[PDB]
Amino acid sequence: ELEKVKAEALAVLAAIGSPAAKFAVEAVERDHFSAIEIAARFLLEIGDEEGSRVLLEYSDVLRKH
Amino acid sequence: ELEKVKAEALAVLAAIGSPAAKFAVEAVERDHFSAIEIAARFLLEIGDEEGSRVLLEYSDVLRK
Amino acid sequence: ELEKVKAEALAVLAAIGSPAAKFAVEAVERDHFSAIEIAARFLLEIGDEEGSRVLLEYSDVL
Amino acid sequence: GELEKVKAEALAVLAAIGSPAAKFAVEAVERDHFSAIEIAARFLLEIGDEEGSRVLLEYSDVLRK
Amino acid sequence: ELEKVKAEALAVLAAIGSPAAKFAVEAVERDHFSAIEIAARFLLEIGDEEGSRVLLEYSDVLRK
C-alpha cells in the first residue's frame, strides 16, 4: 500500500527539481515526520502546490497502518 | 459537531481562492491535524485572517 | 490567577486591535495551546511584544 | 548548581542585547517555557544574534538534561 | 552508527562557516533534537541544502 504512494511522492518531487523538493524527497525516503512537516511547510511557503499536495497525501497515507 | 462547522469552513476557504487556501481545504477534508495547523499558521502570516479563524474553529471542534 | 491573567490577555489584545490579536483573542477563548503558540510567535515576529508576553503568561499559568 | 548558574549567565548575556526578542527570551528563560525558549532561540538565530541563540541553546540543553 | 554519521555531519556543517552552521554544529554535538530541527529548517530558507540534508541524515540516525 505504502510502496505505491512512496513512489508517487518521490517521482512528483524529483520532477520539480527545486532545492525544496530535493529536501522533500529525502524527507520521504527516510519517513521522517519532522522532516516531512518542514518540507511541506517550506514547499507551501515557496509556491509549490504540487509538492505540498503530494506531501499531504503521502503523510495522510502514512499516518495509518 | 465537526461535520457541521467543517462545511462553512471549507466554504470560506474556497471563497478565499488563494493557492494557500486550496491546500487548506485539502488539509481540512483529510482531517490532518498537523496540516491544519501548518495551513492556519501560513494563512495567518500572509494576511488571511478569515481562513485562520475558521481553521481554528474547526480544529477546536475536532479537539473537543 | 487564571481568571485574572486571561482577562488581562484579552484586554491587552483588544487594546492592540491588530487582526493578529483578534485571532489571538479567539485562541484564548478556545484554549488552543497550538493557536496560542502561533499567535505569540506571530506577534513577536511583527513587533507586538506585549501581546506575545501576555500570551506566554496565560499559557504558562494554564 | 549547573542550572542555577547557567540561568544567571543566560539572563546576563540576554539583557545586554536589549532587543525585543531578548526581552521575550529573558521571559522565556525566567518562566521556564520550553516552547517560548524554542521560539526565542529561532528568532534570535533568524535575526543575526548568535550569542543569544547560542546561550539559549546551552540553557535549554542543561534544562532538558 | 551514530558516532560515524556525527563526524561527517560536523565536518559538512563546519565547512559552511555560516552563523547558521555554527549553530548547527552546536546542535549536533549536544544531540539536541529541537535545535537540529530548527537549524535544518533555517538552513533550508537560507540556501544551504547540503547542511539541511546532512542534518536530516544525522537526526534520522539519532532517533534510534
Neighbours of D30 (CB within 10 A): 12
Of A45, A59, A60, which is closest to B42 when you measure between CB atoms?
A: A45
Give the C-alpha distances (Å, rounded to integers) separating C18 from B54, C48, C53: 18, 9, 15
| Euclidean distance between CA atoms C35 and B57, whole angstroms | 10
DSSP string, D15-63: HHH--HHHHHHHHHHHTT-HHHHHHHHHHHHHHT-HHHHHHHHHHHHHH
- Grid coordinates in use for A41? 511547510
Backbone Cα Rg of chain D: 10
State the Cα torsion A13-B28-E41-C21 to the nearest 10°. Answer: 150
Question: Closest Cα to residue E34, out of D26, A25, D42?
Answer: D42
Contacts of B25 in chain A (CB under 8 A): none
Could you give the CA distance from residue D29 to residue D31 in angstroms, rounded to a whole number? 6
Cβ proximity of B36 and B21 under 8 Å: no
Q: What's the Cα-to-Cα distance from E55 to each of D40, D56, E21, E27, E59, rounded to whole Å?
A: 21, 20, 10, 9, 6
Cα separation, D23 vs C15, whole angstroms:
20
Query: In residues, how long is chain D?
Result: 65
Nearest CA to C52 out of C14, C12, C19, C15 is that of: C12
- Look at residues A41, A31, C26, A34 and name the one whose alpha carbon lies nearest to residue B27: A41
Residue in B62, B56, B50 with CA at minimum distance from that of residue B14: B50
Q: B56 and C20: CB-CB below 8 Å?
A: no
Dist. CA D43–CA D59, nearest whole Å? 16
Of B7, B56, B1, nearest to B33 by C-alpha is B56
CB D57 within 8 Å of CB E32? yes
Cβ within 8 Å, pair D24-C44: yes
Residue count (chain E): 64
- Residues of chain D numbered 22-51 and touching chain E (CB < 8 Å): 38, 41-42, 45-46, 48, 50
The C-alpha cell 526581552 sits at D23
List CB contacts (< 8 A) between C49 and chain D: 20, 23-24
Query: Pick from A39, E30, E44: which is nearest to E10 by CA?
Result: E30
Task: Return d(Cα C52, Cα C54) in angstroms, integer.
Answer: 6
CA dihedral angle for residue C42, residue C43, residue C45, residue C46, rounded to 10 degrees: 120
CB within 8 A of D56, min separation 6: which ones? Answer: D10, D14, D25, D28, D29, D37, D40, D41, D44
Long-range Cβ contact pairs of C30-34 (< 8 A, separation 24 or more): C30/B56, C30/B57, C30/B60, C31/C62, C32/B56, C32/B59, C32/B60, C32/B63, C33/C59, C34/B37, C34/B59
